[PDB]
Design a protein around this ligand. Structure first.
Ligand SMILES: [K+]
Ligand SMILES: [K+]
Ligand SMILES: [K+]
Ligand SMILES: [K+]
Ligand SMILES: [K+]
Ligand SMILES: [K+]
Ligand SMILES: [K+]
Ligand SMILES: [K+]
Ligand SMILES: [Mg+2]
Ligand SMILES: [Mg+2]
Ligand SMILES: [Mg+2]
Ligand SMILES: [Mg+2]
Ligand SMILES: [Mg+2]
Ligand SMILES: [Mg+2]
Ligand SMILES: [Mg+2]
Ligand SMILES: [Mg+2]
Ligand SMILES: [Mg+2]
Ligand SMILES: [Mg+2]
Ligand SMILES: [Mg+2]
Ligand SMILES: [Mg+2]
Ligand SMILES: [Mg+2]
Ligand SMILES: [Mg+2]
Ligand SMILES: [Mg+2]
Ligand SMILES: [Mg+2]
Ligand SMILES: [Mg+2]
Ligand SMILES: [Mg+2]
Ligand SMILES: [Mg+2]
Ligand SMILES: [Mg+2]
Ligand SMILES: [Mg+2]
Ligand SMILES: [Mg+2]
Ligand SMILES: [Mg+2]
Lengths: 49, 66, 467, 64, 102, 53, 237, 154, 123
RNA sequence: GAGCGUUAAUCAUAAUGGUUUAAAGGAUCCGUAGAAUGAAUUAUAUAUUAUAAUUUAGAGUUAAUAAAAUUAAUUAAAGAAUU
RNA sequence: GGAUUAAAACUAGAGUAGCGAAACGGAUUCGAUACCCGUGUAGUUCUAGUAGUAAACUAUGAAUACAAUUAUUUAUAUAUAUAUAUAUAAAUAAUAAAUGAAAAUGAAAGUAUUCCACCUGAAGAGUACGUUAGCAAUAAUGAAACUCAAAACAAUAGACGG
RNA sequence: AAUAUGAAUUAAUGCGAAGUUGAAAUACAGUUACCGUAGGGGAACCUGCGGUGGGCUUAUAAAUAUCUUAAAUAUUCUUACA
């Protein structure tokens, strides 16, 4: 519709992707000394030595 | 004559009478006013206005208009 | 399932709003007002809509016979005051949106345009009249006031005998009906177009678009709309004679010339003590008769608003009308008879005037209370997409016939120029018909200029003096 | 010939368009009888006076 | 002549245009796609400023008529988003462009 | 859009329709029958000029 | 001929020249055309009424609107073949303008053939200036002729003084005869009175005709003689 | 009838080429739904019920007595010397009907040629029929509906 | 063609190059014995004495093979290896004998394109 | 490039085709199958299909009124001329 | 699948003026198994059959929906101040748009939908072989190898034309 | 009986060079060509019968013309008159 608002979040839903701002934020928490760096969801595989 | 009709003019026609098509003067007036404003604008802007008419007798009108 | 009260349609880049209550003469209720108010906000945000066209589907019978006040009267009789205040908040908020709308709005006043209808057109710089136009403000006979911002518009747009809002007070206090060409010559209508040409004009309005990198809200596009309408204007009827003669214009300008603290009695005194021509004297008696068959309270309230909304900004004038309307439906001090009079005339068909009881002279404090917001009843106008206020219409002057104050300004300026030349009536006509770009060739412009000079200017030698 | 040259040269054109004439070949058509000298001279006269008023308004703005 | 260009790099959508015996099938392409088209069409796209384009020519492959047909297709067979929006009274949004907007 | 596309004939409307249609067929049959008799009458008037003996 | 595109888009083609830089200077017409856009739809438009007689175009009478029997005595119970043919073409064909006055005009000149011999000027002066009161036949500004009768007849039927058009027409005809007889006498008498005071005239109408006939009869005499001598020689063969 | 729909799509193309402002189409539920979608999408200026002779000015109830004489009247739009409704073609043809799941409709709107159907182009309208209702393909995808891909309008 | 005609077989003809060496039986080359060496005249507008040879292949097919290069030592009963490739100006000569294979020696004193004429590299 | 060439092969390289005049409308029509195609409204269902009811715009039947004297088959006649 | 299907041809029985393959003669010609002339058999005709072929052509399968004009006839209907006028169809002609390699098509060779037939370089070839049908002549069906880089249509400018 | 092979024997056809006997076709090609069919002839071809245009739509005259204020008035006219 001529007066319907369509923004980045709506576009993200149409393209079935996380918002571009979210992608930027997730890419900033990758540095080893950066905030948000987390890796624990994989510690669920039984191992025997 | 209705026999010489160029049907692309259909929207300007008011009707047919005595074997000819009658032009809708209400539209002629609106088109004439629009055309007149264009001539006035170009004249007021300093443009070159050329009046072309090659039917017999038109020269007098054409010369005075220029 | 039922036919919608207001119909919305697309006309190329123009959006057509059509009032669709033929059986009620397109009377405006809360539903209609709310629908139009909401749809206009959307069109303001849209980048594909260049202009809006407000018309009726009942033309030439009526465009809008006025707000639906008969229903508001029943609310008052049932103490449904919340319903009544909703009806006026919607209507007045729509009148404020139209006044401040940034895109051109073109109203086709093809029929009875009385009351709310005036509010739908008076606030648009492109208010087109036709032979079938019948402009009137018949509120004094129903016990109400001149609403829909008519106390801010009429004192600023009328052309003749309106230096001190004299003509504005004459129309609001007498409820005189103006017809077609007369409405255009008075300034009530910006343009005069034959009804037969409305179809063609509508199509042309939809086809025109802002050029290059200009939005439809630019002054450039407003000029384009004005030119398009002018191409459809036709010369006035040969026999047509203006409704008000100079003598009748002299009675209004003198008998309705009050001060900042004037009263309806002062007008009654002038109409009762007027001296001059026999026609003028007889004309003053006719006004006196009419003004004595109105609501004694409504006349005083109308005068108050005209003297208050003639120097205020648009938002404060429209807000003051909402307060007055609410302070009248809820008659706390039994000072008005709006509800009882409305039932006597509309709900019940009675030709005779309602016998008035509140025949006193309200004080300045009483009038202030009736036109001031009560701290217990909070009412505010709905927010529009423009949210702007101003003391002068931004476009009305450019595209209507000039007022008597604009002609005077040019005579005074020309008469006080270093040229040391003489101002001549012929030079005045030329300056208004063939000089101003937006007024070039404007219908009935030379006739109006001659009415002003023949009644306001003194011709001495080859010059003109502003009596 | 003249109309097609005007199109090629991007020159706006005005013309009287009779019922047997093609409207789209001109920028601003004027529907009307093109065979009578009275009709033509009437329409030409109106356009000529419109031009005159434009010229007079340009010469006036130069003076003042 | 001026030819409409979407994002000044490609055409608006796809074009199936017939110029005399030449059948032109032109498709718009993503940024960085390059010109993958008939050699005659390639040269025209270079001069016009088209960077991304795919297409195939069927039936006649006469160079002269491909060039003229291409020019005609770029002008008579394209419609800008703005022209479509105004004609239909609708808003047309480029989803890819909105996704990277503020 | 909400209006139904078709409204079926009410049983009463179908009765009046059948009356008119039966009348139309009957009137045409009667008018043809009377025309034939009027031709038989005009042939009787002239059969005195015809020879069978 | 194809609907042309390049005549109405001169502004847009010019704007591309200016934006690119191919054209350095804005043309004088450029601003004027931008403010006054050309009409570019060139569509065929339907029409729903004949402006002359107010006949409605595009209306189909449904069988529900014809409940009574027809002239044949039969009821209509189903649409006929004509009702089932799409009639869109009638919406676009220029309507034939008709006028009741045209029928009377043909009648008047059939009844009075010699009124045709009175020259009529078709060149108009100003149609908008005609202020005629058709309560009387004579009008200042126009001749007395057949049209005076027709307009008088219409005024009578419009004022409802007469009901039948024939009666109004006959009433107008007699008013016309009276005025024509007063003018035939004013001219005869004026000529008679002038001759009685010594007015002299070079050539009368009868004399003018004799002179013209002589010019023709003189050329005819020569040719006849010539062609009556070639025949004699050719026949001698 | 898909045949009737094919006739209507061709008819609209013919009328656009000559630039007639008003034309008529057969009076059926499918035609009405088809026209209504075009009207809401801005391809048609107006949509009125009427007769063989023209649009109705006042409401005329449709019954078996006049059903054979009913028509739908549609107004065509033209802007800037170009028709708004330039082309109108069927996707699902009478002799080859195409039913797609919602997953394949999403691919069609994403640039993927499905079952030889060229993908949706910018500014194009593709209509889908599901349970005898006609809707835009994007609306069918929103409602998770599977349906027949009827036609594409540009 | 209609949709049903396509269902019944109608369709575009397939494009695939056809074999021009049918006598080899889809083999790169076949051994043969020269039956008779011959000299043939090109078709116009060419003029030359083109050396050819009739050969009986190990599969029983008898073919005419062109002997390329300047000078050859092929005789009757010589063992030759035949490959595909026609002599354009000689109609009916659709094959070539391989120089430097069997009893056919490489071109004497060939300097350029030696591999095409069975000539070994000079030290 | 430790490969290069050549021969033998496979895939790709235009039906996002055509049939007055270039390859290509069957002499013509009738009509069977068609796992060919095909009206309208409503209600269900398991749904572009099925079923049921209802409808008359395609396709038919019978009359009435007007019009026309051709096309088949058969029989009975006439005419100018020729030998 | 069925039926009908020009001319020629064939099987029987009639007919046979004129025309007329062939044949035999007369001319023409360097020659003249021709064109022209004569005599003129089959055939051309009728009845009962066989056969199913033609540039059997609009070199254009059938059906349906739809799109801008004019002219001219025809048909039906309507009206009247009675002989025209107004309507709605059909046909034909010239066109717009559209289509097309163009010539052009023009209500289709346009916009669409449905069904059938048919085509896939030239030549070989509508031939060979087989099969089916027929008294027969034949008709239908219908290849491949070898060879070649051709071959064809519309249009353009010339040259030429007894 | 089928399939394959060779085969006495026998039929059709292509290309290549290259003359010979005629001059059939393309122009009115010097007898309009071609289609179907029949007969005849060194060879092309000739002849009969019907069909087709992919040949004649290439289509282009038995000629004959008239009266109202010729001007002190129309012809001039520059936003004037009204
Ligand atoms: K073709
Ligand atoms: K069959
Ligand atoms: K015989
Ligand atoms: K033929
Ligand atoms: K068929
Ligand atoms: K020959
Ligand atoms: K033959
Ligand atoms: K023959
Ligand atoms: Mg003309
Ligand atoms: Mg390696
Ligand atoms: Mg492929
Ligand atoms: Mg075909
Ligand atoms: Mg055929
Ligand atoms: Mg054939
Ligand atoms: Mg029927
Ligand atoms: Mg026999
Ligand atoms: Mg002979
Ligand atoms: Mg048979
Ligand atoms: Mg044969
Ligand atoms: Mg055949
Ligand atoms: Mg035939
Ligand atoms: Mg049939
Ligand atoms: Mg055979
Ligand atoms: Mg050719
Ligand atoms: Mg010869
Ligand atoms: Mg020859
Ligand atoms: Mg010959
Ligand atoms: Mg012979
Ligand atoms: Mg012959
Ligand atoms: Mg020839
Ligand atoms: Mg020819």
């Amino acid at each position: 519709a001529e007066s319907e608002p369509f923004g980045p979040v709506d576009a993200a839903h149409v393209l079935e992707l996380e918002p571009a701002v979210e992608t930027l934020r997730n890419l900033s928490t990758v540095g080893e000394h950066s905030s948000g760096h987390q890796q624990s969801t994989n510690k669920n595989t039984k191992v025997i030595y | 004559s209705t026999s010489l009709w160029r049907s692309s003019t259909q929207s300007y026609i008011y009707g047919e009478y005595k074997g000819i098509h009658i032009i809708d003067l209400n539209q002629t007036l609106s088109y004439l006013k629009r055309a007149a404003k264009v001539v006035e604008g170009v004249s007021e802007s300093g443009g070159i206005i050329l009046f072309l008419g090659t039917r017999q007798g038109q020269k007098r009108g054409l010369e005075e208009a220029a | 399932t039922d036919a919608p009260p207001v119909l919305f349609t697309v006309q190329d880049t123009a959006r057509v709003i059509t009032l669709n209550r033929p059986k009620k003469l397109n009377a405006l209720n809360a539903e209609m007002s709310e629908s139009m108010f909401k749809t206009l906000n959307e069109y303001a945000k849209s980048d594909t809509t260049n202009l809006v066209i407000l018309k009726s589907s009942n033309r030439p019978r009526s465009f809008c016979a006025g707000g639906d006040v008969a229903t508001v009267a029943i609310f008052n009789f049932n103490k449904e005051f919340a319903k009544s205040i909703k009806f006026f908040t919607d209507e007045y908020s729509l009148n404020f949106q139209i006044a401040t709308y940034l895109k051109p709005i073109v109203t086709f006043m093809d029929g009875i345009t009385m009351g709310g209808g005036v509010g739908l057109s008076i606030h648009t710089p492109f208010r087109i009249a036709t032979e079938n136009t019948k402009w009137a403000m018949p509120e004094m006979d129903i016990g109400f006031f001149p609403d829909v911002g008519s106390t801010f518009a009429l004192p600023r747009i009328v052309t003749l005998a309106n230096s001190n809002s004299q003509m504005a007070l004459y129309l609001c206090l007498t409820g005189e009906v103006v017809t077609g060409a007369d409405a255009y010559m008075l300034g009530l209508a910006s343009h005069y177009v034959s009804s037969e040409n409305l179809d063609a004009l509508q199509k042309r309005l939809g086809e025109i678009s802002p050029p290059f990198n200009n939005d439809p809200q630019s002054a450039y596009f407003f000029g384009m709309v004005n030119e398009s309408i002018d191409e459809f204007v036709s010369p006035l009827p040969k026999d047509y004679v203006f409704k008000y003669s100079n003598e009748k214009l002299n009675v209004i300008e003198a008998c309705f010339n009050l001060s900042k603290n004037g009263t309806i009695e002062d007008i009654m005194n002038n109409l009762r003590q007027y001296e001059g021509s026999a026609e003028g004297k007889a004309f003053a008696q006719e006004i006196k008769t009419k003004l004595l068959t109105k609501s004694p309270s409504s006349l005083q309230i109308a005068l108050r608003l005209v003297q208050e909304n003639s120097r205020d900004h648009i938002e404060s004038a429209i807000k003051r009308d909402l307060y007055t309307a609410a302070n009248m439906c809820m008659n706390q001090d039994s000072l008005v008879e709006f509800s009882e009079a409305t039932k006597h005339k509309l709900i019940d068909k009675q030709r005779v005037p309602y016998p008035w009881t509140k025949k006193e002279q309200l004080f300045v404090s009483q009038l202030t209370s009736i036109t001031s917001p009560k701290p217990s009843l909070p009412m505010s106008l709905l927010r529009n997409t423009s949210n702007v206020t101003w003391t002068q219409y931004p476009y009305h002057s450019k595209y209507q016939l000039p007022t008597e104050q604009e002609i005077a300004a040019y005579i005074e300026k020309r008469t006080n120029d270093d040229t040391g030349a003489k101002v001549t009536e012929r030079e005045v006509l030329n300056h208004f018909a063939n000089v101003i770009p937006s007024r070039r060739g404007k219908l009935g412009i030379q006739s109006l200029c001659k009415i002003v000079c023949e009644r306001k200017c003194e011709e001495v030698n080859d010059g003109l003096r502003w009596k | 010939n003249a109309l097609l040259e005007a199109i090629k040269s991007r020159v706006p054109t005005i013309a009287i368009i009779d019922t047997d004439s093609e409207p789209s070949l001109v920028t601003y058509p004027i529907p009307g009888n093109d065979d009578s000298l009275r009709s033509v001279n009437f329409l030409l006269g109106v356009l000529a006076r419109a031009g005159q008023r434009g010229l007079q308004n340009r010469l006036a703005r130069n003076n003042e | 002549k001026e030819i409409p260009r979407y994002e000044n790099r490609t055409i608006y959508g796809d074009i199936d245009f017939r110029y005399h015996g030449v059948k032109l099938h032109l498709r718009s392409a993503k940024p960085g796609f390059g010109l993958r088209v008939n050699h005659v069409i390639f040269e025209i796209c270079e001069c016009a400023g088209i960077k991304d384009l795919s297409g195939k020519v069927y039936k006649s492959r006469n160079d002269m008529n491909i060039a003229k047909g291409t020019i005609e297709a770029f002008t008579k067979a394209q419609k800008t988003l703005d022209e479509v929006a105004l004609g239909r009274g609708k808003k047309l949004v480029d989803v890819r462009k909105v996704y990277y907007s503020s | 859009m909400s209006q139904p596309l078709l409204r079926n004939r009410s049983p009463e409307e179908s009765e009046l329709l059948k009356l008119k249609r039966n009348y139309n067929r009957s009137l045409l049959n009667f008018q043809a029958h009377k025309k034939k008799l009027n031709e038989l009458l005009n042939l009787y008037h002239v059969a005195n000029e015809f020879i069978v003996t | 001929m194809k609907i042309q595109t390049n005549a109405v888009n001169v502004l847009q083609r010019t704007s591309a020249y200016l934006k690119s830089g191919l054209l350095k200077e804005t043309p004088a017409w450029y601003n004027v055309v931008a403010s006054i856009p050309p009409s570019t739809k060139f569509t065929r438009e339907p029409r729903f009424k004949n402006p002359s007689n107010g006949h409605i175009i595009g209306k189909l009478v449904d069988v529900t609107e014809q409940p009574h029997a027809n002239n044949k005595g039969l009821y209509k119970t189903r649409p006929n073949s004509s009702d089932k043919r799409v009639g869109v073409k009638r919406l676009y064909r220029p309507p034939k303008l008709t006028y009741v006055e045209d029928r009377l005009r043909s009648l008047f000149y059939k009844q009075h053939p010699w009124e045709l011999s009175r020259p009529k000027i078709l060149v108009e002066n100003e149609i908008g200036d005609e202020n005629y009161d058709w309560s009387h036949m004579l009008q200042i500004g126009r001749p007395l002729d057949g049209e005076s009768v027709i307009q008088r007849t219409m005024y009578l039927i419009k004022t409802k003084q007469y009901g039948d058009m024939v009666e109004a027409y006959d009433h107008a005809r007699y008013e016309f005869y009276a005025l024509r007889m007063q003018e035939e006498t004013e001219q005869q008498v004026a000529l008679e009175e002038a001759e009685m005071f010594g007015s002299l005239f070079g050539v009368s109408a009868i004399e003018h005709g004799i002179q013209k006939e002589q010019e023709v009869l003189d050329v005819w005499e020569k040719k006849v003689v010539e062609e009556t001598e070639l025949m004699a020689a050719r026949t001698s063969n | 009838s898909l045949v009737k729909l094919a006739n209507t799509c061709a008819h609209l193309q013919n009328c656009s080429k000559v630039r007639v402002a008003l034309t008529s189409i057969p009076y059926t539920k499918l035609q009405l739904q088809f026209a209504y979608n075009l009207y809401q999408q801005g391809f048609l200026s107006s949509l009125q019920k009427g007769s063989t002779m023209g649009p109705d000015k006042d409401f005329v109830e449709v019954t078996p007595d006049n059903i054979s004489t009913r028509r739908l009247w549609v107004g065509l739009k033209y802007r800037d010397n170009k028709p708004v409704l330039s082309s109108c073609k069927l996707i699902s043809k009478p002799n080859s009907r195409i039913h797609l799941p919602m997953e394949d409709m999403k691919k069609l709107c994403s640039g993927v040629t499905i079952r030889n159907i060229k993908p949706l182009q910018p500014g194009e309208l593709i209509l889908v029929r599901a349970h005898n209702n006609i809707m835009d393909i994007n609306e069918a995808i929103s409602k998770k509906l599977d349906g027949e891909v009827l036609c594409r309008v540009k | 063609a209609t949709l049903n005609q396509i269902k019944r077989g109608s369709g575009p003809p397939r494009r695939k190059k056809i074999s021009t060496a049918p006598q080899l039986d889809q083999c790169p080359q076949r051994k043969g014995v020269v039956l008779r060496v011959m000299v043939l005249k090109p078709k116009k507008p060419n003029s030359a004495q083109r050396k050819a040879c009739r050969v009986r292949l190990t599969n029983g097919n008898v073919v005419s093979a062109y002997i390329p290069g300047e000078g050859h030592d092929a005789q009757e009963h010589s063992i030759v290896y035949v490959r595909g490739g026609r002599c354009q100006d000689l109609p009916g000569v659709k094959y070539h004998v391989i120089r430097g294979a069997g009893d056919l020696s490489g071109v004497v004193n060939r300097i350029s394109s030696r591999s095409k004429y069975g000539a070994k590299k000079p030290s």
